[PDB]
């Protein structure tokens, strides 16, 4: 397929099936995702079960890379700044670089406790190129497509 | 030769300090109370019942001089408040209707007052507020008339107005004898504007009774101006106000004899000595 | 001095350690007022005409930004983004990095900085303001002026042929002398005394204030191609913009309508007001100056051909196309003919509306007519630029002209139920009128009260009683109110007569809404402004203010029912609004009434399982429409794709 | 098309100093100013690059058409001379046609007002374009300085034709709808009159429409080229009265004519109750798109 723009959109779904078969899969359609669904899919791809036995950054930190953990904190902070009902001012955020950020499950549940509409409100159309150029940059390459 | 004569004698900025501002096309009339009364009846329904007791006499007494229409609409809101079950609001609208029925003219009935120098947060502004609260016809002068001051005087009227009160608002420099003479001619003879096909009646004719010269001279301090300023402000007090009292006493002279104008002078240790020196001329 | 120096200078600074920015919120659904309460209606939804879509284009752009500036006097972040996208201040590019870029300087703007860096620019570009030329031509071509000089002298010439010289001197030869020049291979005419030559001096009356479209409105950013914008008249361009806005704001395509009904049951009654005044003066100026105008613009300059372009391009409907001209009630008469076509059964989805334009010829003719606001007179009275239009005010001296209009989408309640469509209002009554014998033209019209003959037996009261709306339930009057000396107190008299003809209880208030102070008097496209305003009022519950009012005029004081509003009354669940009344007193003896009822009449007509499924589908379509606008505002996949 | 550039003397007229200054307001960067006290004015003299409009007006002759009878005097009906002078001739023709229809079927609108209420009588005469001759008359008066009335920009509108008809003749308060489709205005006015009667909004509707060919009309239609070219048809050898030949092998476009008229729709109940001459029974009226 590769290198052929029209052939990509021709056999798109076959590529999705083959990547879901292999161990570096695709997302859903990211422009249709909910913020809660977005963060849970990222944690499912990166951490998963806490089951990995290869080259961790330390013991007790489930992230395989510092670029992956600040990837996750920038997605959390844009979820904050996007779902809050204000468009101007600096606002007190959560996630002050702690074990609450080192544990991803309690990080997500602390978001949904404050913002209940993170379960329903879908993703803004300008956060998709944010997410692509966020995954593009200069670190350990990411665990998905 | 003449301009540097005036520069050496009076000052460099003399024509812009003395330049005439007054123009009778820019006079603003604020005599609508029935409309703001109806809108205030609406927003009393919009405000909750918990904050009515905080202003229960004041809200009962704002609607004293109003119309038959405001009375009937107050009874309509009373009926709807009885149907909804707002017992405070029902008695409030009954009180408003009973008060708005009353026809008698107020404390300051027909006292055509002229107040000079009423800015935001000032004693002259509070005097204008109490005169409108009595129900007078106030003529306020001011320096420049723009959007901020227009909103200020409009909210001042719609807050403090009562029975038949009217507020007229003109832009007049209180350091120009041309403006003082034009202002007393305007308060004297009428102003009828005419367009092409027909005419418009604006100002009837007015003879004053009060006078309040609270004219603040100037707030400028970035010029090192004190030598010319120390006589220019003394002009702005003394000869401006006695030219003013001469004109306002003149305009209702031969029409209404035994009708006497009334002046209240303000005197504001050394400032009190300057005030007493301003007095005993 | 010594206890003022201490506290003010050493005032400490405290900044929060978290301190994350604020971003413009993602598109969430509408939050309407808590709806009122009335009983189930025995009316079947086959006998209801509802307003499903609607969009406009005027001095504030779309109806979203116009209503936001109408209520809260300032734009939201989405409105700033929409106007900066529309007026060309911001493009989306992705070659250095995907993001919005500035037009003139080209930098990655931050979403947190959008309002604080672009609010003042769009507030300058948008509103009632001084006439700014957007034709890229010389302003010294179209003005009446008198010249009559007589010339007795030499005529220096150009290289023409002998036949062209002879055809020039065909009219000449009794008033002239002919001399051949072989060096230029022509002749030379030389005319005697009495010969006048046109020496066109073009004057300039400056500072016309008006209600123009936003400066730098680029309709190509919607998706209309450049050759389309160049060849086709700009009224038809605006009509395409408004129509695709209405369909993609209520979440359609016409393809779904063609799936559910036959193409002969869809009509289009967009009667454009005058029809290319700018286009006709462009034709004649190209004819004089020799500009290569197309040789079919005399064919396709006609006012029906605007919506015929709309039919032959976009909707493809075979149905009954009726284009009316009353020149200040075209939208109103198009709406009432669309609704009585639906009352017949001739159609089931009608696209109604109308558009306008002010020309140089328009402003010169209206200045010669002298019922508009004279700029010299109003600046003599000392009124700023944004407050010339002042209806129900003591210092009013004529109307302000604006350009724009739009479209609304009428549909039958059966289609609304079967497709699940967002009902914005329920049309209960739409009607036009004449005025009768008045030979003296400054005598105004009053005969729009024929809708209320008989009291409770009148057809207006009977239609409102069919929908379950009593006489006191009519709450808001969106008056015509052009801010002239004539049409305000008599229209106050007209609504007073309709109120006590319908048998209004004594002292029930009527909220007077008049947004001509906000927009201006777009001539035949004003009823679309009024209907979008009244639909949005019945949605949100708020009442907009008349911000250009200072003192209510005296002779209005006899009206026993009106409430002139000066501040945004936010009626939540405190005072429910159930109906509304428009008027349009058009040019030259024409009047128009149309009532509107809150959409819970439509929700109360049907049965209590289909109402739940209907609310699901309609909310889904509204949300999908506005997030499709958000996808078009950010990424791409533009609106108006042409196969 | 004329474009000549002039570098020479400008002989002038007695104007004021202020009028001369207002003339040379646009000028002063392309010219020289010289005052003349003997004429109490100035004189502008403009350099090279200065173009002057030198309007030559061509003549395409022998247009064949369908005009109104030559010497049609509508004053002989009864319309006054000031009415004919001030009011547009489309509205003049509309008054003629309407009084012809009423006095040919034997009415007055007064009898209609006797038998029904004035809000049940309408007027839906949507005139086709609306004063093309009137608009070019306005602009030619504006250029040449003819003292045109200062309200003709107001009352030039196409609805105002039948609004003159209502404010003068019929006096009906009813639903006035004026449509423009520019070759089916009469048809769409008739179908909107009949479905208003099918509603019950009216019981007597005056429908119709009118047209006019202008010099602008014939020039624009000649540039559009779907009309009959006089040179082509005289090359084919066809006489003056037979250019319009539908369903013929030698047809090459339509012939334009001016006119129109009015018809009077009424409900059968009024027809029976007043005894009116029914000329036809309308069974179906409908418009369509494509």
PDB file of C-alpha atoms in Angstrom, chain D residues 28 68 77 79 102 117 132 145 173 184 193 198 230 244 247 277:
ATOM      1  CA  UNK D  28      -4.868  69.892  -8.255  1.00  0.00           C
ATOM      2  CA  UNK D  68     -48.573  49.751 -28.231  1.00  0.00           C
ATOM      3  CA  UNK D  77     -60.064  57.226 -21.177  1.00  0.00           C
ATOM      4  CA  UNK D  79     -56.774  59.739 -16.780  1.00  0.00           C
ATOM      5  CA  UNK D 102     -64.379  46.387 -14.546  1.00  0.00           C
ATOM      6  CA  UNK D 117     -66.066  43.486   3.440  1.00  0.00           C
ATOM      7  CA  UNK D 132     -37.054  49.951 -16.879  1.00  0.00           C
ATOM      8  CA  UNK D 145     -29.667  67.754 -14.943  1.00  0.00           C
ATOM      9  CA  UNK D 173     -57.312  46.462   2.438  1.00  0.00           C
ATOM     10  CA  UNK D 184     -44.486  34.095 -15.889  1.00  0.00           C
ATOM     11  CA  UNK D 193     -54.875  34.494  -6.404  1.00  0.00           C
ATOM     12  CA  UNK D 198     -59.049  28.292  -2.000  1.00  0.00           C
ATOM     13  CA  UNK D 230     -33.535  41.881 -38.404  1.00  0.00           C
ATOM     14  CA  UNK D 244     -42.730  35.690 -35.123  1.00  0.00           C
ATOM     15  CA  UNK D 247     -43.570  25.881 -35.272  1.00  0.00           C
ATOM     16  CA  UNK D 277     -70.521  37.064 -16.084  1.00  0.00           C
TER      17      UNK D 277
END
